[model samples]
Target chain A: PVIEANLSLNQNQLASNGGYISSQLGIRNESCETVKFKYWLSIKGPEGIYFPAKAVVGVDTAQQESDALTDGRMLNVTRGFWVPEYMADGKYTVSLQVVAENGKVFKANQEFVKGVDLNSLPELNGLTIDIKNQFGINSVESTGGFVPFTVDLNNGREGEANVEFWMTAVGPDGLIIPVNAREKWVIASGDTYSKVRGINFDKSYPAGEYTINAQVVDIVSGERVEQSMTVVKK
Target chain B: PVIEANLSLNQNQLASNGGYISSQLGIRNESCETVKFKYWLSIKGPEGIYFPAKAVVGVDTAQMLNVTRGFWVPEYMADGKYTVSLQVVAENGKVFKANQEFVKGVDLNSLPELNGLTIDIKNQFGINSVESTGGFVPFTVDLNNGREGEANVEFWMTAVGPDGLIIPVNAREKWVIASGDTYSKVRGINFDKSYPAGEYTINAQVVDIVSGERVEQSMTVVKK
Candidate 1:
């Protein structure tokens, strides 16, 4: 899925060997002298089996004003990003992309074309956060209503893991309201769990966009993942 | 129970011997509606002795200031001038009572005429007497009930002087017998003065206060 469809990358430029796959790609704001960017990470495996998003950030910094790759600044992520231990033994790809101020975009991808087969049952690694909206309501009414959120956990570890989740909600004005923390347990690898949290939207909020970010951590691995969405509120 | 409660019997009713005193008592709500209310009905005797109330339920709803609820008077009541009382209580702890004396008091418009009008007067050797001779006048008056039904009576006896003056010499509330049956009283009187001299007459009477049916007798004694 691409927004600001404006960037590309080298195919299979790197390989994931150890516990992580790491890379350093370049981004050039070819449109504006003064600019900002937004980017995120995703690892795609067997069809429809992409691991949860790693991170999403609103970048408000000027584009890089120097050139130094291997000249001093270089990629050193031998333990960079975690991969699904249960990932199906097949070809897979990793994507990292950034969108510039004027829709200028840059994306990097490295497919496992050289055939380093790794497959597992769960096909998901590390801690993951997701919410199933009860009725697929794309947004909620701000005056007063309820949003059914069923948080899910998929632990792709060798042992049992306790995952902790905390959700933060922000409205149109970007005012964050941090909800309480919840804990879930996935007994072992190849385990997935779901729990529900009925969220009530009281009248205290102004009508506009609202985003909820569910941040989860794997207590054993200490690895964390986040899933966020800005939804409509009328 | 509000003693001044207004109640009326259903169809203007009468007495009882037993079975069930089945009659409806009317309760008019000349009251208010600002509060909730609970109400019930009671059966009362003539002398104001209350029997167990009838089968009446709670009218928890409301009275819109003049609507009425009919109460069914219950069973096993006695023969007397009774009152059916309606009790109303407001949620604010304010109580108001009303009732109507629709119970007939054994009918009071008919009785026997004056008959067997005879009384015996005597001089006594008594104290608390009006005579210095100590008159113990054992006066007796008797009569048969010539009325339609049996009722209680109130009897009295008096003496008159030569100058036509009266002194309440004897009186007692009594009971009478049924029709054609005789009932008599022989209680003595206290002669308050020396019999008043010269043919003083004893006047006695038996009366049924229900119908005012009364019989009077005169026994005379000359100054002896």
Candidate 2:
């Protein structure tokens, strides 16, 4: 299980006056269209478990707080909360969830303050990847041709790492597990990698639905991530 | 037992457009703050065969939603229940699941014989109950066509736990029986050795695929 939720309470939020510590609450939108958000900030510790310092944000009194974000946009609170100096010295965490019009929710927890300065940095390790599942080779039905697919990979890892590709396919009859296909390459940091892949029916492939499982392994960390796609032979 | 996923695909959607049927999805957080989830849709064919369809809006990408009002489900398959499932892979890799079943068929209410049917649910002991600890529970389905004319039927069976889990069982697929005649069939439902010691239920349904007429029966199995 992941850590329940981390409401960051960074050291910078401490005011020079040695009184209230002020910190910003930031939000990120990967592409999801969020109309409003609900959040809560806590006093890291004065009392052990949780010190419910302020009233729940956007709960009822004023209607849940709102925001506007397009794809690849980060929004930060124009304001910051100033914690009373009397409160104990510790970290702070805030939890908020995006609520779609239908009340659909996208939840997240962010740490605003961690006792250590270096500890306040974000957690992404620079490795991001994705692969598309479906594609038509040509006019298969009338042309008697086979089908092909595309796999796209990105190396945000900044350094060089061995990028390997492995794929396993299953025919529609729910049987016929075919010989796996494999490929490998050394990718430089900050590079985009894409390839074309597919199966041929003339190779004794059956006439039915199919499932292709694909994976990418980093030789350095031996860390492997995978995805699957479905297709039809008919 | 967990609550069933709230997935609903109205008849009118599939009625007007045989191409793309739309459905509404409602998800509950249960947890106060937020929880992440992933999901997809699958079609359970008339022959008890399952064919997976599309993935939910986003794949492995982290997603947390309490509802998708205009969520769409394709109605391209043959007649059967299109089961939509929501799998929430928690932050810690815990895969949580919930399902909702939607049927695609003609007018069942227009059929006169839809209601005139009787079923005999028998287990190894030839009763309404069985000891799940007793290994495979040999079961029989004796369905009678209590109506006036010919009955064209197909059967589907599932063993359900208190939870909304669906366990498919092999049963007589298609049959045609005359009035006053009983269609007798038998199938064995094996319980996993690790089946928890609790009462489980055997749910069966007989449907005249042509007329869209259907009747259901369920039997409880007591486990040690």
Candidate 3:
């Protein structure tokens, strides 16, 4: 799942924009060869549904699109369409899909509700976190080994926020250990932060389920966010 | 591409058969929803070719064979019959094809060289009168590869029924024929039982894969 897809509309809750809607798409091919793929977008409005790109092989679908090899890089593109005057005041559902030649698919979607202010839309706070074992795995054997983990944090708050991040693990034998050093940093709106942290386990430790916990605290606003997962040591 | 297809024979060069020859196929549904598909394998040897898997859609081209489709070459059908083709057709009228040119045991120098082509309507049957509820009418065409080499051609069969209604029977078939070979096969049209009863004219055409010249021949039949 290292291959990530991100899409965002210029205005999610649109009331006025000269009858036009646009979006930005980003596909990060973090761990894949030069990938070949086909891309297409669809929009559903009160009037009906239509595809923005011409269908190459079949009706209302995609065609031969890209052959660029993405070696640890991101491909970005912008696609948009002019909304018909009569259809601009209603709800619209937009979706984009990028399908690899190998059958793997990446998708993104957004819904626009009419008669609402963009500032009034629901917004997320603090950070969204994911914890994965350093070798890009989530499980480990009970044998003694130096296991490292990577902490991924993405800011979803509306503005900049000063934050503190800490990760801790609780072993099956009721033993607790800190997996990483505490971190203090400022994350701007809609940005991401990542770092490597690890732990060394002794063979004497019992084999069972270990709970890994990650916490992010918005120091300025006193807001706290936490996420955790359990991994089997056996 | 709406759907892309790929196929490969397990063993391109076969000599012993305490085993079998199988294929692995991969079809990427690049941009299409659930689709209808047909698959089959064809083998042509020096002795003679018998479709190990009976043709589901036609005589020897394709059938219901799938991802694990294969053939057990009786030691007899193994020597001269070296050419093998795997045909997979999607319901969208798009045919995805792959084949081996020479899978023979003989030296390359001894193989037939490449040349001219011709097709003759050898015979037509099952064309007699039928009830208003239509039935299948079949015809045979003989393709003659006059010289040494190989030929790839497209066979088109269509018919004009009562009130000038156009009916398609095995619309288009693409094939590869070897030199010095007289290739003949049966293909036909199926009229829906509701079709009107009257006289009909059926046409057959062979488009040379090389020269692009089309040769056609037609005949008339009637239904009660």
Candidate 4:
């Protein structure tokens, strides 16, 4: 007789943090004989191709006479699993398979369809910047002033992809600040990468409301997306 | 030929955790042949009686491979034998033995002399009285509200007795607060007749300055 198998996550769903995904499993058996079992969990991307995912769990057996509980069974059995750098936003599938002690096995799976809009991500407003640590040839004492602002990237997705970030500062004249230069960096999906590294604002540049625009590009797809923040230097 | 034979602790010593005593072994081999070695560390008490103490340590050989200026060899071994515990403390003539792999095996044994004052021992100082339940009573709360202070016992000298060497020692006195009445509870040492029969002081005591002035009381123990 086939042992009935059930698979479920700790939660019905989860918000993507750069690309980190987590869930749980529950199983039951009505067979007369004690069942020995082994299983695997996998995640499918937007293209429907299944990739391996890790499971963190514990086992509970009814036959054991002791009333004590055993815990902490973490394994990294799946190779080449995708852990995104910045955001994991997409529909995904989770699957499972179990083998019994008598050689009889069963299988089950589920799909979580998620469509995330990056523009709705929360924002950090009106942040005043300070040059706490300066790089080579850049000094807070020599610049006489600095401006700070915040940028938010909503990455609620799964899968691994390279994301390029670009920031440009615009002065009160609606033109790029000639003395201040632009900067770039990479952020992994699901994780918020904060940059406190101050930009070099030459002593000669005029101070006013400066608008900073940031763009993220999927290096593989050559697609570009953008967001902006504002700061005041007096 | 006897190679380098010495016992080095992973740490010079260990913190007195009361429940367990811990230390590691460092084995060195100075002989020409690669030595296969196994060792056991034991302990003894004041009466020169062997107590259960075991040492689990990894054995290694130190070799210098490079011939450059100031070049030094490093210690290498196959596996580590760790977390060994002795059931009890070692008395005088507590033997530690090792079987070496080279020809004409060297058997070495030595007794660990108890010298240092007992450190971090908790005293059952304030419990003035206890209700007999005809079972084991907690050494603390039943004693003196558990305000017992610890005394440091130091080994003075090792004298060779009929059985072996009798180590003379004294328990250092420390002060403690007396929150309630004090009572004595049998702890640590066994009281059964099968063991040695003599007045043996395992712990020491002192009265709380304030409690002593308010309610003066004397305390003593008599063997039935």
Best of the candidates, lDDT = 3
Tens digit per residue, CA lDDT, model 2, B87-124 = 43333333344555555453332322355656565674
Chain A TM-score (model 1): 0.45
> In the order shown, what is each candidate's alpha-carbon RMSD?
48.6, 26.3, 28.8, 29.2
lDDT of 3 by residue, A4-78 (tens): 677788876655433566788787777756666555455533311222322122111111235444668887888
DockQ comparisons of all candidates to the true complex:
0.00, 0.01, 0.01, 0.01
As for DockQ, the candidate ahead, 2 or 4, is 2
Give the number of the best model, judged by DockQ. Answer: 2
The reply for model 4, stretches above 4 Å from the true place, is A12-22, A47-50, A55-88, A101-104, A113-234, B1-224
Candidate 1 local Cα displacement, residue B77, angstroms: 90
Q: Write the per-residue lDDT of candidate 2 for residues A98-178, one digit (tens) a residue.
A: 333333334344443333233432212455555554554322332124556676677777687686555654333223233
- For model 4, residues B26-131, the per-residue Cα lDDT tens digits are 3344456664333334332111111123322223333111111110111111111122211111121112322111101111121111111111223245332222
Q: Rank the candidates by DockQ, best first.
A: 2, 3, 4, 1
Residue A211 error, candidate 3, Å: 36
Q: lDDT tens string, model 4, A1-234?
A: 335545655433335543344555555555454555554454533311223353122111111111111222222232222334221344455665554443333556665534443223322121111212222232233244554444444444454445544445433321232211223334444555455434444443334344444444455554444343444444
Superior by DockQ: candidate 2 or candidate 3:
2
What DockQ results for candidate 4?
A: 0.01
Model 2 regions lying over 4 Å from their true place: A1-234, B1-5, B10-13, B16-20, B32-34, B41-43, B47-64, B67-76, B107-142, B146-178, B184-224
As for lDDT, the candidate ahead, 1 or 4, is 1
Over A144-187, each residue of candidate 1 has an lDDT whose tens digit, in order, gives 67776777676656677776555655333213333333344555
Lowest lDDT sum, 10 consecutive residues, model 3 chain A, at: A54-63
